[PDB]
Amino acid sequence: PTSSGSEGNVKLCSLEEAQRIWKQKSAEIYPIMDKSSRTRLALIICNEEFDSIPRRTGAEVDITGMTMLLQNLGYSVDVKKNLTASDMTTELEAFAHRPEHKTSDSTFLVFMSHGIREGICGKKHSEQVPDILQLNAIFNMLNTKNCPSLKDKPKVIIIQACRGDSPGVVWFKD
Amino acid sequence: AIKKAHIEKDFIAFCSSTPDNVSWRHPTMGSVFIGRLIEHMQEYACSCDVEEIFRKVRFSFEQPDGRAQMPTTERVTLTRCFYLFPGH
Numbered sequence A: 001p002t003s004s005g006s007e008g009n010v011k012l013c014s015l016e017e018a019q020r021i022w023k024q025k026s027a028e029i030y031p032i033m034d035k036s037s038r039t040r041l042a043l044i045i046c047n048e049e050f051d052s053i054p055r056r057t058g059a060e061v062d063i064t065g066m067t068m069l070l071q072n073l074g075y076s077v078d079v080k081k082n083l084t085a086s087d088m089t090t091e092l093e094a095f096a097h098r099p100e101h102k103t104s105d106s107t108f109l110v111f112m113s114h115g116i117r118e119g120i121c122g123k124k125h126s127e128q129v130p131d132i133l134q135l136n137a138i139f140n141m142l143n144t145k146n147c148p149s150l151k152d153k154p155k156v157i158i159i160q161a162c163r164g165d166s167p168g169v170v171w172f173k174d
Numbered sequence B: 001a002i003k004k005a006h007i008e009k010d011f012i013a014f015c016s017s018t019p020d021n022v023s024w025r026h027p028t029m030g031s032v033f034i035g036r037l038i039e040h041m042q043e044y045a046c047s048c049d050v051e052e053i054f055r056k057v058r059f060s061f062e063q064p065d066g067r068a069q070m071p072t073t074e075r076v077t078l079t080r081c082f083y084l085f086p087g088h
């Protein structure tokens, strides 16, 4: 039991358990491409330093952890930092156009920033002049029309961001 | 010949809190949701599909701790189980 391999700290699926899973509901599992030839891609967009919002100290720990995890799972990881919403849109359109998706079976996109109810904050965001990327735009840029190379393939979007100012709790009597 | 495909399919999104609500980040240890997601992926990618792993992350947040948050999966059009088969 060693974390020395490419998978690091991710526990491995034995080929025993793999064919156990693959025979119990095979018609309902996404197919995996051959490890020797597949070209999986992932994209991490992280905003830590903002023009008018407090810095997200600790963000570098998040980048490190998600980058290593996604590499452990077999993805080649692009990391982009401190982007406006327009920059984020441009990076997503470029990612959707990557030729590797054709020889990939799946993708992960990770977004880490400040957020408000409406979406994810760009580098220059303020309530004076909002700089927001909506989740709806992310889906549209990766869907079958705008990213045909990922048709029928799982697209996993992870978002670390506040969604408002509320604490998310209510009191009840014990 | 041309054929029709669903325009939106095989997506899952996983957000760090519920709508209107904050997510927490430790200034030197990183975001709570990110660290918890990594731990769960590391432990369960070998045995559980991604939707089930996200559910387990949700469960791990179930009791508040002064800094409560509830991760939410959104806009799910996965038609199959997504197993990562780590090592293959």
Ligand SMILES: CC(C)(C)[C@H](NC(=O)c1ccc(N)c(Cl)c1)C(=O)N1CCC[C@H]1C(=O)N[C@H](C=O)CC(=O)O
Pocket (backbone or CB within 6 Å): A056, A113, A114, A115, A160, A161, A162, A163, B022, B023, B024, B025, B026, B027, B031, B032, B067
């Ligand atoms: C980093 C901080 C000092 C500002 C604060 N954290 C703690 O006070 C803390 C203390 C001890 C702890 N063990 C842990 Cl876990 C956390 C924090 O996170 N917040 C304050 C209120 C809303 C929320 C926040 O800023 N949410 C961002 C929304 O956009 C999400 C993001 O930037 O990722």
